[PDB]
Amino acid sequence: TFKSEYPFEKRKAESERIADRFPNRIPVICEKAEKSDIPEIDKRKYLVPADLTVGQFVYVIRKRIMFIFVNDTLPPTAALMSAIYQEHKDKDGFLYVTY
Amino acid sequence: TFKSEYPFEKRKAESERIADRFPNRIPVICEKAEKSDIPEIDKRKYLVPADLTVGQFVYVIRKRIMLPPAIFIFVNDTLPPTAALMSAIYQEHKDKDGFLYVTYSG
Amino acid sequence: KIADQSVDLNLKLMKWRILPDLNLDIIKNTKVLLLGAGTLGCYVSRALIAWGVRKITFVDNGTVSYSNPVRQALYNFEDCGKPKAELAAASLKRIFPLMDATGVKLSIPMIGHKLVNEEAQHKDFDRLRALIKEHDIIFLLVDSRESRWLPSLLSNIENKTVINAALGFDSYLVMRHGNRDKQLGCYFCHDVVAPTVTRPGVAMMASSLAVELMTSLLQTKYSGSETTVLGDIPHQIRGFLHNFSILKLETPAYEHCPACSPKVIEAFTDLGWEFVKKALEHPLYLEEISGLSVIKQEVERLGN
Amino acid sequence: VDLNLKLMKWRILPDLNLDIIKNTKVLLLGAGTLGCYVSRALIAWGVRKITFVDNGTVSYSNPVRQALYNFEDCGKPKAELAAASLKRIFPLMDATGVKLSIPMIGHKLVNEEAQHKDFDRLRALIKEHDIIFLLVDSRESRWLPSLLSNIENKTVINAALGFDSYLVMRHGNRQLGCYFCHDVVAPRTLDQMCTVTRPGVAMMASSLAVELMTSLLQTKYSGSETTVLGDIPHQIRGFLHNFSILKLETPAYEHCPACSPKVIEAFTDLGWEFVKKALEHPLYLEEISGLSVIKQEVERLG
């Protein structure tokens, strides 16, 4: 997993570096759940724009691997990534999601 | 409750007697849910005919407590359909003492 | 040529472009009896001809009222005073002139009433049974349950498929009757199993669902599923306008139903009109025959 | 006809406002299967003024599906025929038909002079009515009416059909999403001009669309989204294959090619000059709405 690879001090660091360099972007991290058998994509970290919707984010993942739950909660397709960021951002500053 | 008042030896004895005096009837114990606030029933032991439906058994309870128009019946933590026959539920949710235990709540 | 082809071509396009295994011919050749040419009968008949149904027969004993045209989609303002069944048939032919559209002015005898003319209502009973026997699907589209009983019994006896549509103020029930062959319930099973002016949209919803249930029901059932090429074949559809909801329900036949009880079937088979005339004037005799009498007297002994 | 409605009020729903429904001026964009069944549901609800808009003529296959036309009507223009048909039902109707082509997005202009006049007449018709029903058979015929009705702050009720499903939804006002929000927020037979639908679908969508209007016209119970007639859903999706109805609500999308504030402002400043460019070059619309920037950011992340 991403959290396993990097410690918190490095996670919170680049996150706070993303805010100053790409403030319009939102640092999001995705990885398939253990139960899902779908392909796992080529990338995990994404600097999605704040005005991006979840449904638009589904399109980017389906393109990278031919349902997207977050904390036992599948958000509406119409939800913006910036809105989900204000409520679900981790202590490091990233937005962790799964599918 | 009914099972608290009588021990199993007495319960299974009366139930096996009911099968003699009334072969085509099902012994039903009906009690109010200890949480819900519906008028407590006055009679709790019912000898209903085998072909009686759930909805017909709902009707007799509603009038047994003079409840004006909602009533729900429960058997072993499920809501049986209204079209079900009491014999079919008695065949499946029967207790070892020979009684069918049902509960009603608002 | 373009007369018949236009409607059928539209349906062929639907079949070959979307649902190749759809059976259009079974629908087209289905002979439909519409009991009631009111709001439901008018909308049902329009959906049926759009599906290519060639033979539709209206049964109705009423005349067009001044307020009918605004709700009953086959009648115009100039039609006030005219008998409904023949007019509804003529109105269908104005839409699609190749229709085998027929109207029969006929009173369905109603249970719970003293006979006003034994000879005439006997003749009406014979005509009703003959009409049901010659058709394939029977739509029960009369507003009163006392008018549903005789057609339900005759259609069951004649082994025809019945589709009931009934309206509440903001709700509707569409259901198909069980047949004799694990038998499904009929319109009268529920009220004895569970004893205790409409919004314009209700009839439009009920009519279209009833026809779409029929067309699905006419397709061959997939093995291992209660579905067809057109989808589900539910027993009952209940819809509500106030919350824009729709529920599917299924009910078994009830042994003591005053309509489809095996004893009621047996008594009709034995006596026909002789049994019917007694049931019409004394509905309590029906509950005796079906066994409901013993059930009701038993519900008393349990509740007293 | 009024007596059946009058009984509905005091015998059943005393708080039901019938006058607001009767005096609602209704514009029907489309006199096909939806327009015909919608208008019948409307007059049953007592609506007095109904205007049909259609640029078509009755085809041989129309009468069995379009409940205002008879066999003898084939070849006649639809809009005026539909209005006269309503008067055959209810002679006191204020029913009129207007033969007008709605300019469709994604097409070069065939006759700018005539299509400019049609644009003007469309806007004046939307302006003079209270409720606009969008009952055409294609997405491209929905754009301009959706924009103009939003500019004129009129309530829009959209109905669209698939082979065995339907969509009924009302447009938000300057807020809820519009018809064009979903497809760009969530990037098959529904609203496809080549789709032949199961006959019952148009009947269901039509009645629910009108029942939604009558409820929407009633006052809201405070602390709730309900009226004396029940719910006022944003979207209704019905399916025939499993006899289900699903309700859904979506917010207005910032980069929608129809209701985005930047699209509103481009129209407000440039008018027909913006509309003409949008009709012939829809990508120019996505540039104005900001969808272009979002589309190329989905591209880079992919």
Ligand SMILES: Nc1ncnc2c1ncn2[C@@H]1O[C@H](COP(=O)(O)OP(=O)(O)OP(=O)(O)O)[C@@H](O)[C@H]1O
């Ligand atoms: N026993 C019967 N025999 C034959 N036809 C009947 C019988 N009972 C009812 N009908 C017909 O069934 C139809 C029911 O239609 P519907 O209820 O939609 O409208 P209505 O009752 O005619 O008028 P309204 O809309 O004012 O109720 C009526 O046309 C009526 O004439």
Ligand SMILES: Nc1ncnc2c1ncn2[C@@H]1O[C@H](COP(=O)(O)OP(=O)(O)OP(=O)(O)O)[C@@H](O)[C@H]1O
């Ligand atoms: N751009 C437009 N401007 C004006 N009217 C339109 C436009 N696009 C479609 N219409 C009208 O809207 C209606 C669409 O409804 P519908 O699809 O039920 O009718 P149809 O296309 O004539 O019938 P069918 O689809 O069975 O061939 C048609 O009557 C059509 O004439």
Ligand SMILES: [Mg+2]
């Ligand atoms: Mg009636």
Ligand SMILES: [Mg+2]
């Ligand atoms: Mg079309």
Ligand SMILES: [Zn+2]
């Ligand atoms: Zn029955």
Ligand SMILES: [Zn+2]
């Ligand atoms: Zn929009």
